[model samples]
Target: TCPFYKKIPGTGFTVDAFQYGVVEGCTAYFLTHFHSDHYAGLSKHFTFPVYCSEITGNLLKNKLHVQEQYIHPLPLDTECIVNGVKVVLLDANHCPGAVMILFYLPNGTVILHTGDFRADPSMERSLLADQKVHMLYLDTTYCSPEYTFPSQQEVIRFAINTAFEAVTLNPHALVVCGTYSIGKEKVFLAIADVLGSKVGMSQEKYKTLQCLNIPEINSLITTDMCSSLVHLLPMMQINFKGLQSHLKKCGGKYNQILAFRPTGWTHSNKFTRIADVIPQTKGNISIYGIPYSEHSSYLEMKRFVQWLKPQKIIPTVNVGTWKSRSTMEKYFREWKLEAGY
Candidate 1:
C-alpha cells in the first residue's frame, strides 16, 4: 500500500524504509530517527548506505548492531550531496536525534520531509524559513482539531508536580513513569532530579543512553530498580494489568503505586479517560496521562503548512489512505476556524 516511504521523482534518493517490492535499485536512503515504526525492517545487514544525524547513526551501530561502514553521519544544517542531489539536515525537535530532511533536486525542486517533529518557534530563523518548498512530506500524526493540548514543557512540569504530590500523599508509593525506550527520557530525568533520586530502566535503555553519551541523559539513569524511588519502565510495563504484576513483584516493598503516562493522547477523553486534574486511579495504581508529544498538533501543523505554502502536501503516515490535496485543504479550513490566526 506504499505506507512507509516516499521517493523523489527523477532522483535516486529515498526517505525512510522501503516497503516490499520497492527495495531494489535505490541509490541511498535517509533515516529520520530510531523509533521502531520508522526504523522497521532495518537490521545489521543492508545493501544501500544510510544518512542521518550522528546520534541516530550511533544507535544503529550500538543498539541495532548495524555494520559501521554502511552508516553516513550527516551534520545538522550542513548541505551534503548524495548521488548528485543537494540535501540538508535540520533539527526536528521531535526527539534527541530526530531531523527534518530537505532535498534540493537538480531540476530546482525543493522537497521537505518533516520526519516526526513538533513545531518549534526557532525554526523561523533556521534553514526552513524564506524558502520555496515544492513538495512537503509532513508527519500529520495529530492532524485532528480535538488534539489541542499545552506545550511539552508545561505538560512535563505538570507531570513532575503530580508525581511528587502522589509520593507526598502516599510516601510508600512507587512512581512508575511509562515511557518509550528513547522518547521520554526528559520526563524521568526531571522526576529523578526533582525527587533527588535516580531512575531505574532496562539494560537496553541504559545502553542506548550510554551510546548517546550526552551528560544530561547519562547522569540520571541507573539499571538498579531498587536503588531509586522511581522506575522508568517501557510503555508495556506501566499498563493497568502490567502494574498489578509489577506491584506483586514489589512484594509489599512499597505500599502503593502511581503510574504516569505522558502522551498527547490524553487530550482525547475517549482515549485516556482523563477529564481533569492531577490524579486518577484504578485498582491499586493511580494513573495520570500527561499530554506530551513530539508531533505537532492540528493547529501547529496548519501553521507550519501555511508558513511554507508548499505546492503539494503529502502525509508521511496514512499515505495509502489519505486523499492528499483535498485532505490538506480540509485541514487548512479547520485550522482557520480553530486557530483564528
Candidate 2:
C-alpha cells in the first residue's frame, strides 16, 4: 500500500490512498508530510484543498508535481479552520517538509495528532501559548524505553560509514539507499557533502529549489559527485542500473550509485517497523542507510501529552484501531492517577 490519500470522512484513512470511512464525517484530513503512507491515498480519492505546512505543500507540489488546486498550504505555527475544526501545524523536525497537526475542536476538545515527530524540545516550544489542548493523538513507535541507544544522527552516520566503506572497496561498485523521496533530502545532502558537489534535480523540483534558495545544498556538480551524466540527473530513472552505467562516462565515478527507493513508508503506524527500514545495505553497491525519519519517540510523545495535559491521548500512524483505543484508555488512567485528574 502506498502512503497517499484524500481523506473521506468516517473511513479510516490509510497510506496508499484507498478510500474507506472508519469514522463518518471526518470533514477534512491533514497530511503531515509527503511520505507515501501519509499521502499515497491522494490519487485514490477526490479531495479539495488538502491541508499541510507550506514546506510540505511545496515539497509535494514541486517534488511530486501535484497541482496547486490539490494543495492547501499553511505555515508552521499558524492555525487554520477546515470544516469548522481549527488545526495548528507544527514542525515535526523529522524531515525537511515534515509537520505535525493539532486539531482544536469547537467543543473545547482538542486532539494532537502527531504525524511522525521527534523529541526536539525546541519544536515543542514553538507552539502558540493559546493552545490549551485536551486530547493527544501521538506516535507510539519506539514507545518502549528499551528501544534506545541508536540515535537518529548515529543511524545516518553509520549508514554513511557503511556507504564509504563499500565505495572504497569497490570504486566501480554502485550503492543505492532506499528512502522516502521528500524526507531523504538529508541523505542527499550527506552524499553531496561526501562527494563535494551538487546533484541534479527534477524539472519540477528544480523550479521550487530555485525559488526556495536552499543555500545549504550545492546545485553544482562535478565528475566525482555523481557517478553518471550531469544532465538528466534526479530523474526517476536514477533508480535504474542501466541508466547508472551510462552516467559513468558523464563524470561520476561512483559505481553508478545513488540512493534508489520507492515513495511509500511515510505513515508507518508502528515504531518497530519504522526501525526496520533504517538499515538497508546489499553487496557491492554501498546503500547508505540514512536514518531520516518522521515520528516522535516514546519519551517525546509522553512529554507532549504531559504538556497539553489532554483528556485523552490517542496513538495514530503505527497503531491498529483496536489497540489504539485500548492504549488511549490506559494512558488516560495512568496520566489521571499521576496528575490526580
Candidate 3:
C-alpha cells in the first residue's frame, strides 16, 4: 500500500497525483516512471503539464497517448527550473527512465523525493552527498528486515543458471520468463540471449520496448509466439492455473513449461542456492520463484538512510495503517542512530 501522499509537501507540485484526479492548487504534475501503480489515473483527456525523463516522456506520449504539449522531457544530471523551483532528475536504477527527483526550492529547504528506487552505489556520489536533504520521501517497499535479496547481477546470473539447468533436463521445455512492462527485463534478456532464442512478447509490449531504443533489448524481441521457446509473460501468468492453461494453449509442442517467477518479494533465511529457494510443481507446469527484485532490500535501504542522514524521513509504501508506519520508523531510527547522528 503506497502512502496517500500524491503531492510533495510545501512544493505546490504533485508527484504521481494523476490517480487522485485534478489536484486543486497543484502548479505542475510529475510522474516517476511508466508503471501502472504510479500512473493509474493518467489519461489522454487530462491535460496537466507533466515533467519526466526523456524515456518516461516517450512512454507517456507514445504508450499512454498523452498530448505532446503537456509532456516536458528533461535531461539527467542537469538543473531545470519549473515555477521558480530548481529540479533535477537523477537516474533511478529501478526501471527504465525511472528517476529520483531533487528539488531545490525557492526557500532554503532541499527535498529529495526518491520515487520508488533500488538503492545503488551511484547515490553515494557528490550530487546527493553534498546536499543537506530536508525531507527524504523514500520508497519503503521493503522497509522491514525480511527483504534482503541479492544484488541485481547476482540474482540475474542465478536466474540464467537455473533456467539452463531446467532446460538441460528437459530440452523440450518452453521457458517462460515472468516480467513486467519495463522493469526486470535484464533477467529475461540474459536468458533469451544465453539460450540463443528470440524472446516472444505481445504486440503492444514489443512496441513499447521498441520505443526505448536500447540495442541490447531491441535485437532479441519477437512478436510471434512460435518464433522462440523463451516467452516473456506478466507476473500474474506465472501462477499454476494460468501456466497450466498456457501449456494447453500451446498444443503439446513442449513437454512441460519452466516459468521463472522473477521478483524481489521472495526471501530465504539461509539463502545459498536455487535448490534452497522454493520451486512449485503442479502437473506439467513448474514455477521457480526467484528473488530477483528491482527494489532495494531492507539492509540496502538502511545503508541509504544512514548515508543520506536526512533531516526527515517520509515512507512511500506500506503506510496504509498506523502500525505499518511505526514499524518502519523503528528501522529509520535505528539507521539514524547507526549513523551516529
Highest TM-score: which candidate? 3
lDDT of all predictions? 0.77, 0.53, 0.82
Candidate 1's displacement at residue 115, Å, is 1.1
Worst 10 residues of 2 by lDDT: 7-16
lDDT of 3 by residue, 1-341 (tens): 22346666667798877777667778899888889988898878868899999999999888888999999999999989997789999987888889999998777899888998999777899389777898898999988887767777877777788778778888889999876668887888888877888899898889888777577665698898886889888888889888887878778788888888776675453365644665778877778777777788888888888888889888888878899989998888888887886
TM-scores for every predicted model: 0.89, 0.64, 0.93
Least well predicted 10-residue stretch by lDDT in candidate 3: 266-275
Candidate 2 lDDT, tens digit per residue, 34-86?
66666654551345456777776776665566677877788777767666666
Give the CA lDDT, 0 to 100, for residue 34 in model 3: 86
lDDT of 1 at 265: 62
When summed lDDT is taken over every stretch of 10 residues in candidate 1, the lowest stretch is: 267-276
How close to the true structure is residue 166 of candidate 1, measured as C-alpha lDDT?
70
* Model 3: CA > 4 A from native: 1-4, 267-275
lDDT for model 1: 0.77
Instruction: Sum up the clashes in candidate 3.
Output: 0
The segments of candidate 1 whose C-alpha lies over 4 angstroms from its true place after superposition are 1-5, 266-275, 322-326, 332-341
Tell me the alpha-carbon RMSD of every candidate.
Answer: 3.2, 6.9, 2.3
